[PDB]
Amino acid sequence: DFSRNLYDIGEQLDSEDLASLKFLSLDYIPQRKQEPIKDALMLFQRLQEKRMLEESNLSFLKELLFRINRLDLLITYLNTRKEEMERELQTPGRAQISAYRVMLYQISEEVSRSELRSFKALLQEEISKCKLDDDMNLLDIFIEMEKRVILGEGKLDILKRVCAQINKSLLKIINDYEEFS
Amino acid sequence: DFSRNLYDIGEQLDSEDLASLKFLSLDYIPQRKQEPIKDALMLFQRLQEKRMLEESNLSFLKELLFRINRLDLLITYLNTRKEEMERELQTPGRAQISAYRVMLYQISEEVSRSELRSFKALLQEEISKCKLDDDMNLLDIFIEMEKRVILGEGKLDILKRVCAQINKSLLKIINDYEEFS
């Protein structure tokens, strides 16, 4: 009963819904493991894979659907109302999605298209002014590059991009590394 | 005697050496547990803590000293020559530092101060590459903000800074989040 019903819920969702649900699951499935999920059913399988979703274990499904405001699916397939879910989530700790993620999603729902363009513009303003100070030595800079994830054992792209403009011999070293690995 | 000698070697090293050796130890001691390590002798203690450095087990100590080209300490206190260590590390696998880390360190050794200026400039160029195409919705933008590590569970500065220029209600959301933590 549960499995077929989860299939029906799987089909009733559109793209925007899947994006939202992919976001609201980031507490359990890292960013790194979200490219594999292309449709809602694969997300269901990956959620049950961590035993966060089972028959008689629908807390997280109910919460997810309420947050993305698909109350029609809650009623049609889960027999759950809005006020019931509000009562459930307003009792401390019963909410399973972090306040961080819910905050971000609600910021997203409040924003229009024009306001989104404003956000892109302002974010490109604040990014086009990153300031690493003058007291960081090179090794620290490599550590920051690994931190901001632009350099790694298998991401020599940017490192080669800068070294190629500094001096070739460095690029020679890098090529020796990646060609002997 | 072993402890006394390791103390003497511990004090003979300067700051640049400690930075280098701290880097070349990143295969075993994560970034996070290196702020506690403030001096070279403490680094020795943290190396013995993981039993990669023992009495009669100096492979990694010798390797460390050779890499940072402190051959004077190798000879003075360890009675070990340059060419012997070269033979040691050129025998496969006996070098204990990964080719990645050693590659980064030699890139560091080759670079002058001016060339480092060029590296800072070019890297600030590549970070100020915005991407942010017209098909990314807000949530994706949040995910890249977390990537470039300018947004996080406890780093709401930039997010509030942009929302304050878009519309206050967003700022109200963020403040409600962080004052509820």
PDB file of N, CA and C in Angstrom, chain A residues 23 31 99-101 103-105 107-108 110-111 115-117 119-120 122-124 126-128 130-134 136-139 141-143 145-148 150-153 159 161-162 165-167 170 174 177, chain B residues 20 23 26 31 99-101 103-104 107-108 110-111 115-116 119-120 122-124 126-128 130-134 136 138-139 141-143 145-153 159 161-162 165-167 170 174 177:
ATOM      1  N   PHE A  23      16.607  20.534  -1.949  1.00  0.00           N
ATOM      2  CA  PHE A  23      17.196  21.480  -1.007  1.00  0.00           C
ATOM      3  C   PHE A  23      16.908  21.078   0.434  1.00  0.00           C
ATOM      4  N   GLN A  31      25.350  18.035  -0.520  1.00  0.00           N
ATOM      5  CA  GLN A  31      25.360  18.585  -1.871  1.00  0.00           C
ATOM      6  C   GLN A  31      25.991  17.601  -2.843  1.00  0.00           C
ATOM      7  N   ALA A  99      16.640  24.730  11.058  1.00  0.00           N
ATOM      8  CA  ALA A  99      16.131  26.089  10.902  1.00  0.00           C
ATOM      9  C   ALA A  99      16.883  26.843   9.817  1.00  0.00           C
ATOM     10  N   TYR A 100      18.150  26.490   9.599  1.00  0.00           N
ATOM     11  CA  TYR A 100      18.936  27.095   8.532  1.00  0.00           C
ATOM     12  C   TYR A 100      18.276  26.867   7.178  1.00  0.00           C
ATOM     13  N   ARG A 101      18.060  25.596   6.830  1.00  0.00           N
ATOM     14  CA  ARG A 101      17.489  25.253   5.531  1.00  0.00           C
ATOM     15  C   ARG A 101      16.097  25.850   5.354  1.00  0.00           C
ATOM     16  N   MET A 103      14.898  28.487   6.767  1.00  0.00           N
ATOM     17  CA  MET A 103      15.107  29.917   6.562  1.00  0.00           C
ATOM     18  C   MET A 103      15.442  30.218   5.106  1.00  0.00           C
ATOM     19  N   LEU A 104      16.398  29.477   4.539  1.00  0.00           N
ATOM     20  CA  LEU A 104      16.773  29.687   3.142  1.00  0.00           C
ATOM     21  C   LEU A 104      15.590  29.469   2.198  1.00  0.00           C
ATOM     22  N   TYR A 105      14.833  28.384   2.399  1.00  0.00           N
ATOM     23  CA  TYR A 105      13.718  28.102   1.498  1.00  0.00           C
ATOM     24  C   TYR A 105      12.645  29.176   1.588  1.00  0.00           C
ATOM     25  N   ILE A 107      13.134  32.353   2.432  1.00  0.00           N
ATOM     26  CA  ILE A 107      13.703  33.463   1.667  1.00  0.00           C
ATOM     27  C   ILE A 107      13.459  33.259   0.179  1.00  0.00           C
ATOM     28  N   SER A 108      13.612  32.022  -0.301  1.00  0.00           N
ATOM     29  CA  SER A 108      13.386  31.756  -1.719  1.00  0.00           C
ATOM     30  C   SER A 108      11.928  31.976  -2.109  1.00  0.00           C
ATOM     31  N   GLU A 110       9.726  33.928  -0.742  1.00  0.00           N
ATOM     32  CA  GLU A 110       9.339  35.337  -0.670  1.00  0.00           C
ATOM     33  C   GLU A 110       9.827  36.157  -1.861  1.00  0.00           C
ATOM     34  N   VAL A 111      10.844  35.688  -2.574  1.00  0.00           N
ATOM     35  CA  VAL A 111      11.527  36.488  -3.585  1.00  0.00           C
ATOM     36  C   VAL A 111      10.808  36.353  -4.919  1.00  0.00           C
ATOM     37  N   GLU A 115      13.349  40.725  -7.783  1.00  0.00           N
ATOM     38  CA  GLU A 115      14.178  40.652  -6.586  1.00  0.00           C
ATOM     39  C   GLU A 115      15.291  39.623  -6.747  1.00  0.00           C
ATOM     40  N   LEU A 116      15.032  38.535  -7.478  1.00  0.00           N
ATOM     41  CA  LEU A 116      16.092  37.572  -7.761  1.00  0.00           C
ATOM     42  C   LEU A 116      17.202  38.204  -8.590  1.00  0.00           C
ATOM     43  N   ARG A 117      16.839  38.944  -9.640  1.00  0.00           N
ATOM     44  CA  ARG A 117      17.855  39.645 -10.420  1.00  0.00           C
ATOM     45  C   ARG A 117      18.657  40.595  -9.542  1.00  0.00           C
ATOM     46  N   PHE A 119      19.296  40.080  -6.425  1.00  0.00           N
ATOM     47  CA  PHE A 119      20.191  39.234  -5.641  1.00  0.00           C
ATOM     48  C   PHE A 119      21.400  38.796  -6.456  1.00  0.00           C
ATOM     49  N   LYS A 120      21.191  38.386  -7.710  1.00  0.00           N
ATOM     50  CA  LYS A 120      22.323  38.035  -8.563  1.00  0.00           C
ATOM     51  C   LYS A 120      23.280  39.212  -8.696  1.00  0.00           C
ATOM     52  N   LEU A 122      23.725  41.887  -6.687  1.00  0.00           N
ATOM     53  CA  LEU A 122      24.407  42.210  -5.437  1.00  0.00           C
ATOM     54  C   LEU A 122      25.403  41.124  -5.039  1.00  0.00           C
ATOM     55  N   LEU A 123      25.071  39.861  -5.302  1.00  0.00           N
ATOM     56  CA  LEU A 123      25.999  38.780  -4.996  1.00  0.00           C
ATOM     57  C   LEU A 123      27.234  38.851  -5.879  1.00  0.00           C
ATOM     58  N   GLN A 124      27.058  39.196  -7.154  1.00  0.00           N
ATOM     59  CA  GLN A 124      28.221  39.414  -8.005  1.00  0.00           C
ATOM     60  C   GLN A 124      29.025  40.623  -7.546  1.00  0.00           C
ATOM     61  N   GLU A 126      29.387  41.419  -4.216  1.00  0.00           N
ATOM     62  CA  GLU A 126      30.118  41.018  -3.018  1.00  0.00           C
ATOM     63  C   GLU A 126      31.166  39.953  -3.320  1.00  0.00           C
ATOM     64  N   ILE A 127      30.955  39.149  -4.363  1.00  0.00           N
ATOM     65  CA  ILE A 127      31.943  38.143  -4.739  1.00  0.00           C
ATOM     66  C   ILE A 127      33.110  38.792  -5.464  1.00  0.00           C
ATOM     67  N   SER A 128      32.818  39.762  -6.329  1.00  0.00           N
ATOM     68  CA  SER A 128      33.854  40.513  -7.024  1.00  0.00           C
ATOM     69  C   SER A 128      34.521  41.508  -6.081  1.00  0.00           C
ATOM     70  N   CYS A 130      36.403  39.743  -3.082  1.00  0.00           N
ATOM     71  CA  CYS A 130      37.044  38.893  -2.092  1.00  0.00           C
ATOM     72  C   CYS A 130      38.454  39.399  -1.823  1.00  0.00           C
ATOM     73  N   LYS A 131      38.821  39.461  -0.544  1.00  0.00           N
ATOM     74  CA  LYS A 131      40.086  40.059  -0.118  1.00  0.00           C
ATOM     75  C   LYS A 131      40.838  39.071   0.767  1.00  0.00           C
ATOM     76  N   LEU A 132      41.760  38.323   0.178  1.00  0.00           N
ATOM     77  CA  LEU A 132      42.735  37.586   0.972  1.00  0.00           C
ATOM     78  C   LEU A 132      43.908  38.514   1.260  1.00  0.00           C
ATOM     79  N   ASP A 133      44.234  38.679   2.541  1.00  0.00           N
ATOM     80  CA  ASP A 133      45.206  39.681   2.953  1.00  0.00           C
ATOM     81  C   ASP A 133      46.629  39.260   2.582  1.00  0.00           C
ATOM     82  N   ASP A 134      47.580  40.137   2.911  1.00  0.00           N
ATOM     83  CA  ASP A 134      48.970  40.043   2.477  1.00  0.00           C
ATOM     84  C   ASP A 134      49.855  39.196   3.387  1.00  0.00           C
ATOM     85  N   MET A 136      49.098  35.999   4.392  1.00  0.00           N
ATOM     86  CA  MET A 136      48.926  34.585   4.102  1.00  0.00           C
ATOM     87  C   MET A 136      50.028  34.144   3.145  1.00  0.00           C
ATOM     88  N   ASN A 137      50.767  33.098   3.517  1.00  0.00           N
ATOM     89  CA  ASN A 137      51.781  32.564   2.621  1.00  0.00           C
ATOM     90  C   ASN A 137      51.129  31.583   1.649  1.00  0.00           C
ATOM     91  N   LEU A 138      51.934  31.024   0.743  1.00  0.00           N
ATOM     92  CA  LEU A 138      51.375  30.223  -0.344  1.00  0.00           C
ATOM     93  C   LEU A 138      50.656  28.987   0.182  1.00  0.00           C
ATOM     94  N   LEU A 139      51.293  28.246   1.093  1.00  0.00           N
ATOM     95  CA  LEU A 139      50.686  27.024   1.613  1.00  0.00           C
ATOM     96  C   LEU A 139      49.303  27.299   2.183  1.00  0.00           C
ATOM     97  N   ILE A 141      47.397  29.657   1.174  1.00  0.00           N
ATOM     98  CA  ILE A 141      46.526  29.926   0.033  1.00  0.00           C
ATOM     99  C   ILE A 141      46.031  28.625  -0.590  1.00  0.00           C
ATOM    100  N   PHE A 142      46.902  27.619  -0.691  1.00  0.00           N
ATOM    101  CA  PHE A 142      46.468  26.308  -1.167  1.00  0.00           C
ATOM    102  C   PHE A 142      45.426  25.701  -0.234  1.00  0.00           C
ATOM    103  N   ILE A 143      45.595  25.902   1.076  1.00  0.00           N
ATOM    104  CA  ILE A 143      44.640  25.376   2.048  1.00  0.00           C
ATOM    105  C   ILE A 143      43.292  26.075   1.907  1.00  0.00           C
ATOM    106  N   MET A 145      42.246  27.342  -0.940  1.00  0.00           N
ATOM    107  CA  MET A 145      41.721  26.843  -2.208  1.00  0.00           C
ATOM    108  C   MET A 145      41.051  25.485  -2.042  1.00  0.00           C
ATOM    109  N   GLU A 146      41.637  24.609  -1.223  1.00  0.00           N
ATOM    110  CA  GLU A 146      40.958  23.365  -0.877  1.00  0.00           C
ATOM    111  C   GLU A 146      39.698  23.631  -0.061  1.00  0.00           C
ATOM    112  N   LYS A 147      39.722  24.666   0.786  1.00  0.00           N
ATOM    113  CA  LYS A 147      38.551  25.014   1.589  1.00  0.00           C
ATOM    114  C   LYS A 147      37.397  25.487   0.707  1.00  0.00           C
ATOM    115  N   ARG A 148      37.643  26.476  -0.157  1.00  0.00           N
ATOM    116  CA  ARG A 148      36.633  26.942  -1.104  1.00  0.00           C
ATOM    117  C   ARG A 148      36.456  25.981  -2.274  1.00  0.00           C
ATOM    118  N   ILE A 150      38.337  24.727  -4.880  1.00  0.00           N
ATOM    119  CA  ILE A 150      38.796  24.968  -6.242  1.00  0.00           C
ATOM    120  C   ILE A 150      40.128  24.293  -6.528  1.00  0.00           C
ATOM    121  N   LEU A 151      40.691  23.588  -5.551  1.00  0.00           N
ATOM    122  CA  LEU A 151      41.908  22.810  -5.721  1.00  0.00           C
ATOM    123  C   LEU A 151      41.774  21.518  -4.934  1.00  0.00           C
ATOM    124  N   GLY A 152      42.140  20.406  -5.561  1.00  0.00           N
ATOM    125  CA  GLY A 152      42.111  19.122  -4.887  1.00  0.00           C
ATOM    126  C   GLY A 152      42.933  18.126  -5.667  1.00  0.00           C
ATOM    127  N   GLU A 153      43.104  16.944  -5.063  1.00  0.00           N
ATOM    128  CA  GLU A 153      43.872  15.874  -5.697  1.00  0.00           C
ATOM    129  C   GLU A 153      43.424  15.635  -7.134  1.00  0.00           C
ATOM    130  N   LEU A 159      44.514  25.662 -10.558  1.00  0.00           N
ATOM    131  CA  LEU A 159      45.930  25.751 -10.211  1.00  0.00           C
ATOM    132  C   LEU A 159      46.788  25.881 -11.466  1.00  0.00           C
ATOM    133  N   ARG A 161      45.605  26.980 -14.215  1.00  0.00           N
ATOM    134  CA  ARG A 161      45.187  28.233 -14.842  1.00  0.00           C
ATOM    135  C   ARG A 161      46.004  29.420 -14.337  1.00  0.00           C
ATOM    136  N   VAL A 162      46.361  29.425 -13.051  1.00  0.00           N
ATOM    137  CA  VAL A 162      47.139  30.533 -12.495  1.00  0.00           C
ATOM    138  C   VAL A 162      48.628  30.338 -12.754  1.00  0.00           C
ATOM    139  N   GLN A 165      49.995  31.374 -16.037  1.00  0.00           N
ATOM    140  CA  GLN A 165      50.236  32.798 -16.201  1.00  0.00           C
ATOM    141  C   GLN A 165      51.395  33.294 -15.350  1.00  0.00           C
ATOM    142  N   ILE A 166      51.778  32.555 -14.310  1.00  0.00           N
ATOM    143  CA  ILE A 166      52.931  32.956 -13.510  1.00  0.00           C
ATOM    144  C   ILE A 166      54.212  32.536 -14.218  1.00  0.00           C
ATOM    145  N   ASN A 167      54.535  31.244 -14.172  1.00  0.00           N
ATOM    146  CA  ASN A 167      55.682  30.734 -14.910  1.00  0.00           C
ATOM    147  C   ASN A 167      55.478  29.259 -15.226  1.00  0.00           C
ATOM    148  N   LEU A 170      56.359  25.775 -12.990  1.00  0.00           N
ATOM    149  CA  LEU A 170      55.378  25.281 -12.032  1.00  0.00           C
ATOM    150  C   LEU A 170      54.407  24.323 -12.712  1.00  0.00           C
ATOM    151  N   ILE A 174      53.310  20.368 -12.012  1.00  0.00           N
ATOM    152  CA  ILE A 174      51.943  19.865 -11.884  1.00  0.00           C
ATOM    153  C   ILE A 174      51.695  18.749 -12.893  1.00  0.00           C
ATOM    154  N   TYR A 177      53.077  15.630 -11.728  1.00  0.00           N
ATOM    155  CA  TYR A 177      52.205  15.020 -10.729  1.00  0.00           C
ATOM    156  C   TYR A 177      51.050  14.270 -11.384  1.00  0.00           C
TER     157      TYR A 177
ATOM    158  N   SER B  20      56.147  24.812   6.811  1.00  0.00           N
ATOM    159  CA  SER B  20      56.391  23.780   5.809  1.00  0.00           C
ATOM    160  C   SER B  20      56.061  22.389   6.344  1.00  0.00           C
ATOM    161  N   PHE B  23      52.487  21.694   6.779  1.00  0.00           N
ATOM    162  CA  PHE B  23      51.865  21.355   5.504  1.00  0.00           C
ATOM    163  C   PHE B  23      52.132  19.901   5.139  1.00  0.00           C
ATOM    164  N   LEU B  26      49.929  17.046   6.407  1.00  0.00           N
ATOM    165  CA  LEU B  26      48.486  17.089   6.197  1.00  0.00           C
ATOM    166  C   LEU B  26      47.904  15.759   5.738  1.00  0.00           C
ATOM    167  N   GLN B  31      43.533  19.624   8.809  1.00  0.00           N
ATOM    168  CA  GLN B  31      43.635  21.069   8.991  1.00  0.00           C
ATOM    169  C   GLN B  31      43.155  21.507  10.375  1.00  0.00           C
ATOM    170  N   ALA B  99      52.120  12.247  -3.263  1.00  0.00           N
ATOM    171  CA  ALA B  99      52.648  13.060  -4.354  1.00  0.00           C
ATOM    172  C   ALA B  99      51.925  14.396  -4.470  1.00  0.00           C
ATOM    173  N   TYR B 100      50.653  14.446  -4.076  1.00  0.00           N
ATOM    174  CA  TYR B 100      49.907  15.701  -4.085  1.00  0.00           C
ATOM    175  C   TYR B 100      50.553  16.738  -3.170  1.00  0.00           C
ATOM    176  N   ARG B 101      50.695  16.398  -1.885  1.00  0.00           N
ATOM    177  CA  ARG B 101      51.242  17.343  -0.915  1.00  0.00           C
ATOM    178  C   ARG B 101      52.663  17.758  -1.280  1.00  0.00           C
ATOM    179  N   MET B 103      54.001  17.762  -4.232  1.00  0.00           N
ATOM    180  CA  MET B 103      53.872  18.636  -5.395  1.00  0.00           C
ATOM    181  C   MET B 103      53.580  20.069  -4.971  1.00  0.00           C
ATOM    182  N   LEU B 104      52.589  20.247  -4.090  1.00  0.00           N
ATOM    183  CA  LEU B 104      52.265  21.584  -3.599  1.00  0.00           C
ATOM    184  C   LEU B 104      53.462  22.234  -2.908  1.00  0.00           C
ATOM    185  N   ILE B 107      56.034  23.376  -5.478  1.00  0.00           N
ATOM    186  CA  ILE B 107      55.513  24.602  -6.079  1.00  0.00           C
ATOM    187  C   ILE B 107      55.773  25.784  -5.155  1.00  0.00           C
ATOM    188  N   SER B 108      55.589  25.586  -3.846  1.00  0.00           N
ATOM    189  CA  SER B 108      55.839  26.666  -2.897  1.00  0.00           C
ATOM    190  C   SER B 108      57.312  27.054  -2.867  1.00  0.00           C
ATOM    191  N   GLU B 110      59.574  26.819  -5.183  1.00  0.00           N
ATOM    192  CA  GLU B 110      60.062  27.460  -6.402  1.00  0.00           C
ATOM    193  C   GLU B 110      59.687  28.939  -6.498  1.00  0.00           C
ATOM    194  N   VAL B 111      58.661  29.382  -5.771  1.00  0.00           N
ATOM    195  CA  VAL B 111      58.052  30.696  -5.964  1.00  0.00           C
ATOM    196  C   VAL B 111      58.760  31.756  -5.126  1.00  0.00           C
ATOM    197  N   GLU B 115      56.359  36.626  -7.580  1.00  0.00           N
ATOM    198  CA  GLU B 115      55.532  35.601  -8.207  1.00  0.00           C
ATOM    199  C   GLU B 115      54.329  35.261  -7.331  1.00  0.00           C
ATOM    200  N   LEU B 116      54.508  35.292  -6.006  1.00  0.00           N
ATOM    201  CA  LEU B 116      53.378  35.096  -5.103  1.00  0.00           C
ATOM    202  C   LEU B 116      52.367  36.232  -5.230  1.00  0.00           C
ATOM    203  N   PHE B 119      50.334  35.359  -8.018  1.00  0.00           N
ATOM    204  CA  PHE B 119      49.408  34.283  -7.674  1.00  0.00           C
ATOM    205  C   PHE B 119      48.176  34.823  -6.955  1.00  0.00           C
ATOM    206  N   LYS B 120      48.379  35.712  -5.977  1.00  0.00           N
ATOM    207  CA  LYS B 120      47.246  36.328  -5.293  1.00  0.00           C
ATOM    208  C   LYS B 120      46.351  37.073  -6.279  1.00  0.00           C
ATOM    209  N   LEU B 122      45.996  36.733  -9.621  1.00  0.00           N
ATOM    210  CA  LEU B 122      45.296  35.856 -10.554  1.00  0.00           C
ATOM    211  C   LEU B 122      44.207  35.048  -9.855  1.00  0.00           C
ATOM    212  N   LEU B 123      44.457  34.620  -8.615  1.00  0.00           N
ATOM    213  CA  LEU B 123      43.441  33.862  -7.890  1.00  0.00           C
ATOM    214  C   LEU B 123      42.232  34.734  -7.565  1.00  0.00           C
ATOM    215  N   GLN B 124      42.466  35.996  -7.180  1.00  0.00           N
ATOM    216  CA  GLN B 124      41.351  36.919  -6.984  1.00  0.00           C
ATOM    217  C   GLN B 124      40.623  37.194  -8.293  1.00  0.00           C
ATOM    218  N   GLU B 126      40.181  34.715 -10.589  1.00  0.00           N
ATOM    219  CA  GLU B 126      39.376  33.523 -10.853  1.00  0.00           C
ATOM    220  C   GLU B 126      38.216  33.376  -9.874  1.00  0.00           C
ATOM    221  N   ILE B 127      38.332  33.931  -8.665  1.00  0.00           N
ATOM    222  CA  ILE B 127      37.195  33.878  -7.748  1.00  0.00           C
ATOM    223  C   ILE B 127      36.132  34.885  -8.161  1.00  0.00           C
ATOM    224  N   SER B 128      36.553  36.048  -8.641  1.00  0.00           N
ATOM    225  CA  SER B 128      35.612  37.047  -9.125  1.00  0.00           C
ATOM    226  C   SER B 128      34.963  36.656 -10.449  1.00  0.00           C
ATOM    227  N   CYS B 130      32.020  35.084 -11.909  1.00  0.00           N
ATOM    228  CA  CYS B 130      30.739  35.020 -11.218  1.00  0.00           C
ATOM    229  C   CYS B 130      29.930  33.765 -11.528  1.00  0.00           C
ATOM    230  N   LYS B 131      29.977  33.279 -12.771  1.00  0.00           N
ATOM    231  CA  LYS B 131      29.037  32.278 -13.271  1.00  0.00           C
ATOM    232  C   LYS B 131      27.641  32.881 -13.173  1.00  0.00           C
ATOM    233  N   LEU B 132      26.812  32.362 -12.267  1.00  0.00           N
ATOM    234  CA  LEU B 132      25.481  32.896 -11.975  1.00  0.00           C
ATOM    235  C   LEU B 132      24.686  33.169 -13.253  1.00  0.00           C
ATOM    236  N   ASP B 133      24.460  32.106 -14.025  1.00  0.00           N
ATOM    237  CA  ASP B 133      23.786  32.259 -15.305  1.00  0.00           C
ATOM    238  C   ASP B 133      22.303  32.528 -15.066  1.00  0.00           C
ATOM    239  N   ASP B 134      21.552  32.664 -16.152  1.00  0.00           N
ATOM    240  CA  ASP B 134      20.181  33.130 -16.024  1.00  0.00           C
ATOM    241  C   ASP B 134      19.207  32.018 -15.659  1.00  0.00           C
ATOM    242  N   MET B 136      19.824  29.680 -13.081  1.00  0.00           N
ATOM    243  CA  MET B 136      19.954  29.285 -11.684  1.00  0.00           C
ATOM    244  C   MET B 136      18.916  30.002 -10.831  1.00  0.00           C
ATOM    245  N   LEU B 138      17.177  30.712  -6.893  1.00  0.00           N
ATOM    246  CA  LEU B 138      17.817  31.224  -5.688  1.00  0.00           C
ATOM    247  C   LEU B 138      18.511  30.112  -4.913  1.00  0.00           C
ATOM    248  N   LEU B 139      17.826  28.985  -4.706  1.00  0.00           N
ATOM    249  CA  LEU B 139      18.400  27.904  -3.909  1.00  0.00           C
ATOM    250  C   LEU B 139      19.749  27.453  -4.456  1.00  0.00           C
ATOM    251  N   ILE B 141      21.746  29.322  -6.043  1.00  0.00           N
ATOM    252  CA  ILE B 141      22.652  30.419  -5.724  1.00  0.00           C
ATOM    253  C   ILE B 141      23.141  30.297  -4.286  1.00  0.00           C
ATOM    254  N   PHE B 142      22.254  29.884  -3.379  1.00  0.00           N
ATOM    255  CA  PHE B 142      22.662  29.602  -2.008  1.00  0.00           C
ATOM    256  C   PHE B 142      23.696  28.486  -1.966  1.00  0.00           C
ATOM    257  N   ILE B 143      23.533  27.471  -2.822  1.00  0.00           N
ATOM    258  CA  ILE B 143      24.473  26.352  -2.832  1.00  0.00           C
ATOM    259  C   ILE B 143      25.850  26.794  -3.318  1.00  0.00           C
ATOM    260  N   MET B 145      26.923  29.863  -2.957  1.00  0.00           N
ATOM    261  CA  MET B 145      27.406  30.713  -1.873  1.00  0.00           C
ATOM    262  C   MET B 145      28.043  29.879  -0.773  1.00  0.00           C
ATOM    263  N   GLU B 146      27.451  28.722  -0.472  1.00  0.00           N
ATOM    264  CA  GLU B 146      28.084  27.777   0.438  1.00  0.00           C
ATOM    265  C   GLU B 146      29.363  27.206  -0.159  1.00  0.00           C
ATOM    266  N   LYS B 147      29.407  27.031  -1.484  1.00  0.00           N
ATOM    267  CA  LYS B 147      30.618  26.523  -2.122  1.00  0.00           C
ATOM    268  C   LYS B 147      31.775  27.491  -1.927  1.00  0.00           C
ATOM    269  N   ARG B 148      31.622  28.721  -2.406  1.00  0.00           N
ATOM    270  CA  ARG B 148      32.655  29.749  -2.264  1.00  0.00           C
ATOM    271  C   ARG B 148      32.851  30.192  -0.826  1.00  0.00           C
ATOM    272  N   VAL B 149      32.257  29.393   0.065  1.00  0.00           N
ATOM    273  CA  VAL B 149      32.216  29.608   1.509  1.00  0.00           C
ATOM    274  C   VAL B 149      32.046  31.087   1.824  1.00  0.00           C
ATOM    275  N   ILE B 150      30.918  31.652   1.399  1.00  0.00           N
ATOM    276  CA  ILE B 150      30.471  32.967   1.837  1.00  0.00           C
ATOM    277  C   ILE B 150      29.101  32.915   2.493  1.00  0.00           C
ATOM    278  N   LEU B 151      28.506  31.729   2.599  1.00  0.00           N
ATOM    279  CA  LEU B 151      27.258  31.512   3.314  1.00  0.00           C
ATOM    280  C   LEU B 151      27.372  30.180   4.038  1.00  0.00           C
ATOM    281  N   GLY B 152      26.967  30.155   5.303  1.00  0.00           N
ATOM    282  CA  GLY B 152      27.017  28.924   6.068  1.00  0.00           C
ATOM    283  C   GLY B 152      26.155  29.032   7.302  1.00  0.00           C
ATOM    284  N   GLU B 153      26.049  27.900   8.003  1.00  0.00           N
ATOM    285  CA  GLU B 153      25.249  27.822   9.221  1.00  0.00           C
ATOM    286  C   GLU B 153      25.539  28.961  10.190  1.00  0.00           C
ATOM    287  N   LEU B 159      24.723  37.305   3.284  1.00  0.00           N
ATOM    288  CA  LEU B 159      23.312  37.088   2.976  1.00  0.00           C
ATOM    289  C   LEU B 159      22.452  38.233   3.497  1.00  0.00           C
ATOM    290  N   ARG B 161      23.602  41.144   4.145  1.00  0.00           N
ATOM    291  CA  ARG B 161      24.061  42.358   3.477  1.00  0.00           C
ATOM    292  C   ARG B 161      23.332  42.580   2.158  1.00  0.00           C
ATOM    293  N   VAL B 162      23.024  41.502   1.436  1.00  0.00           N
ATOM    294  CA  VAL B 162      22.318  41.631   0.164  1.00  0.00           C
ATOM    295  C   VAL B 162      20.822  41.792   0.399  1.00  0.00           C
ATOM    296  N   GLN B 165      19.562  45.156   1.046  1.00  0.00           N
ATOM    297  CA  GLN B 165      19.412  46.014  -0.117  1.00  0.00           C
ATOM    298  C   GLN B 165      18.244  45.608  -0.998  1.00  0.00           C
ATOM    299  N   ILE B 166      17.773  44.366  -0.893  1.00  0.00           N
ATOM    300  CA  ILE B 166      16.616  43.961  -1.684  1.00  0.00           C
ATOM    301  C   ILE B 166      15.337  44.441  -1.008  1.00  0.00           C
ATOM    302  N   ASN B 167      14.930  43.774   0.069  1.00  0.00           N
ATOM    303  CA  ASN B 167      13.777  44.227   0.835  1.00  0.00           C
ATOM    304  C   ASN B 167      13.906  43.732   2.269  1.00  0.00           C
ATOM    305  N   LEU B 170      13.028  40.068   4.043  1.00  0.00           N
ATOM    306  CA  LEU B 170      14.048  39.027   4.007  1.00  0.00           C
ATOM    307  C   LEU B 170      14.972  39.121   5.221  1.00  0.00           C
ATOM    308  N   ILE B 174      15.977  36.425   8.273  1.00  0.00           N
ATOM    309  CA  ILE B 174      17.300  35.997   8.726  1.00  0.00           C
ATOM    310  C   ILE B 174      17.483  36.289  10.212  1.00  0.00           C
ATOM    311  N   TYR B 177      15.780  33.848  12.270  1.00  0.00           N
ATOM    312  CA  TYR B 177      16.567  32.620  12.352  1.00  0.00           C
ATOM    313  C   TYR B 177      17.660  32.727  13.412  1.00  0.00           C
TER     314      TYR B 177
END
